[PDB]
Amino acid sequence: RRRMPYSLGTDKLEKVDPDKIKSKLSEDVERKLETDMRELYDRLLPTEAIEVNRRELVSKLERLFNTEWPGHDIRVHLFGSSGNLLCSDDSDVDICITTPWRELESVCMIAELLDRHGMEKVVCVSSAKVPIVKIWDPELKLACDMNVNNTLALENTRMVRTYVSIDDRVRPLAMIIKYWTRRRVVNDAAFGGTLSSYTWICMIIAFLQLRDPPVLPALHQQHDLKLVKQDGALSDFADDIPKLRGFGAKNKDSLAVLLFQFFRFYAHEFDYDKYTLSIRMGTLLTKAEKNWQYLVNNALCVEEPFNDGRNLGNTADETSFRGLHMELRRAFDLIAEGKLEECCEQYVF
Ligand SMILES: Nc1ccn([C@@H]2O[C@H](COP(=O)(O)CP(=O)(O)OP(=O)(O)O)[C@@H](O)[C@H]2O)c(=O)n1
Ligand SMILES: [Ca+2]
C-alpha cells in the first residue's frame, strides 16, 4: 500500500523566492472558502449515536476484563480522536487498558478473550514497542486498537484536547486538515509510508504556535498553569483550561486565512532540512542541536512532546517526503484560489 512510488526519487524541492509567493487570499476567495469550510466542518462533526457507542465499547471491555481477571483494578479509557475532540463518525477507536497487573501486557491473552466473546477480526501485535490488539465490534460497528498501560498516549491525547479547548478555530481547522489527509491518503504511517494522524495534528499545533500573534501557547512551558492530575502528579503541560482559553484571541485571522497559511507554511515557508517542529517548546529547534541529522527518515522532524527522542516524522523516507511536500504544494495552489473541493479530491492509485 505504498503511497509515494520510488519513481518519484528523493530530490528536495527548491525554495521559491518569498517575494513571489502569494501571501493573502482575495476577499472573494476568503468569503467562499470560509463558507465552504464551515459547511464541511458541520458534516464532519460526530453524531450522538456513534459517540455513545464509543463509550459503550469502553464499558463493555471493562466488564469483560474484570470478569475474566478480577481484583486487578483494570480500567479502560478512550484516547486518540475519540478523546481529543477531533473524531468524526468514521474514526477508529483508540483504547488504553490500565492496570497494576503487568501480566496483562502480554496482549495475546486479551485477543483470545475477545474472540471468545464475539469480537471479529481479532489480531494482535505482541512484540511491537507498544503491543496492540485490534478488533471489529460487530454490534457497535467500531474498529478498535487497544494497548495496555501506554499512559503516555493518554497524556498526549489530553494535551491535544487542551489545545483544541483553547481557541475556537482549532477544532474546525484540524478536522478539515485531517479530512484532507484521509482523502489524499497521506495519513497511513504503517501501510503507506506517510504520516500518522497524530503527526499531522502536531504539525497543525506547531503552525498555530508560530502565528503572529500566536493562536496557541506552548503548554509544556507554561509551568504556572499546570494542575495536579487525577493520579496526583503535576501535569507535564499547562491544563487549566479557563485560564488558558482566549490565549489566541488577539490573532483575528479567519479559519479560511488559517487554512491558507497552514499550507503556505508547510508548502513554502518551513525549512525542512534545517529545523525540527517542537510543540513542547513552541519555537523551532534545529536538527543539529538534537543530533537528528543522523536519524533514518529525518526529512521531516516533528518532535514528540513527551519523548524528545521520538521523531513523529520517522515513518516517511526521503521519497515519501518528496511526495508529501508535493501534495502540500498542490494544496497550497488550490486553497490559494479557494478550491477546497478540488484540494480534498480522493486520491486514486
Ligand atoms: N506516533 C504516535 C502516534 C499515535 N500516538 C497516540 O495514538 C493516538 C492515536 O493516533 P492517531 O494517529 O490515530 C490520531 P487521531 O486523532 O485518533 O486520528 P484519527 O481520527 O485519524 O484516527 C494519539 O492521540 C496518540 O495518543 C502516539 O502516541 N504516537
Ligand atoms: Ca485514531
Author numbering: 248 to 596
Copy out sentences from the published article reporting this entry, exactly as the authors wrote them.
Template-independent terminal ribonucleotide transferases (TENTs) catalyze the addition of nucleotide monophosphates to the 3′-end of RNA molecules regulating their fate. TENTs include poly(U) polymerases (PUPs) with a subgroup of 3′ CUCU-tagging enzymes, such as CutA in Aspergillus nidulans. CutA preferentially incorporates cytosines, processively polymerizes only adenosines and does not incorporate or extend guanosines.
The structure was solved by molecular replacement using the apo structure and refined to 1.45 Å resolution with an Rfree of 18.1%. In the CutA-CMPCPP structure, one Ca2+ ion was observed, coordinated by side chains of both aspartates, and non-bridging oxygens of all three phosphates of the incoming nucleotide. It corresponds to metal ion B in the canonical two-metal ion mechanism of polymerases. However, it was not visible in our electron density maps and most likely absent because of the chemical modification of CMPCPP. The contacts that stabilize the incoming nucleotide in the CutA-CMPCPP structure include binding of the γ phosphate by Lys425, Ser328 and Ser444. The side chain of Tyr445 is located between the ribose ring and base of the incoming nucleotide, stabilizing it through van der Waals interactions. The 2′-OH group of the nucleotide forms a network of hydrogen bonds with Asn403 and Thr404 side chains, thus ensuring preference for incoming ribonucleotides over deoxyribonucleotides. Moreover, Arg557 is located 3.3 Å from 4-NH2 of the cytosine, potentially forming a weak polar interaction.
